[PDB]
């Protein structure tokens, strides 16, 4: 709203499909789209890359 609402990776994840995003534990994300359910479109603030991430692998930072 005045800044990004941050989520953080709890676990490592290796992409294996057409549009998912690999990431390591501790990367932070802006969530771009949550409408799909258990897969969220996100941009990693660590690598700059964008794709789908499993929602059960992340948690809000100010938590």
UniProtKB/Swiss-Prot annotation:
It is found in: Cytoplasm; Nucleus; Cell membrane; Perikaryon. Non-receptor tyrosine-protein kinase that plays a role in many biological processes including regulation of cell growth and survival, cell adhesion, integrin-mediated signaling, cytoskeletal remodeling, cell motility, immune response and axon guidance. Inactive FYN is phosphorylated on its C-terminal tail within the catalytic domain. Following activation by PKA, the protein subsequently associates with PTK2/FAK1, allowing PTK2/FAK1 phosphorylation, activation and targeting to focal adhesions. Residues 2-63 form the SH3 domain. Isoform 1 is highly expressed in the brain. Isoform 2 is expressed in cells of hemopoietic lineages, especially T-lymphocytes. Belongs to the protein kinase superfamily. Tyr protein kinase family. SRC subfamily. Interacts (via its SH3 domain) with PIK3R1 and PRMT8. Interacts with FYB1, PAG1, and SH2D1A. Interacts with CD79A (tyrosine-phosphorylated form); the interaction increases FYN activity. Interacts (via SH2 domain) with CSF1R (tyrosine phosphorylated). Interacts with TOM1L1 (phosphorylated form). Interacts with KDR (tyrosine phosphorylated). Interacts (via SH3 domain) with KLHL2 (via N-terminus). Interacts with SH2D1A and SLAMF1. Interacts with ITCH; the interaction phosphorylates ITCH and negatively regulates its activity. Interacts with FASLG. Interacts with RUNX3. Interacts with KIT. Phosphorylated at tyrosine residues, which can be enhanced by NTN1. Palmitoylated. This is Tyrosine-protein kinase Fyn.
């Amino acid at each position: 709203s005045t800044g990004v609402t941050l989520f953080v990776a709890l676990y490592d994840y290796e992409a294996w499909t057409e549009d998912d995003l690999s990431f390591h534990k501790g990367e932070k994300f802006q969530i771009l789209n949550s409408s799909e359910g258990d897969w969220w479109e996100a941009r990693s603030l660590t690598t700059g890359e964008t794709g789908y991430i499993p929602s059960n692998y992340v948690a809000p930072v100010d938590s």
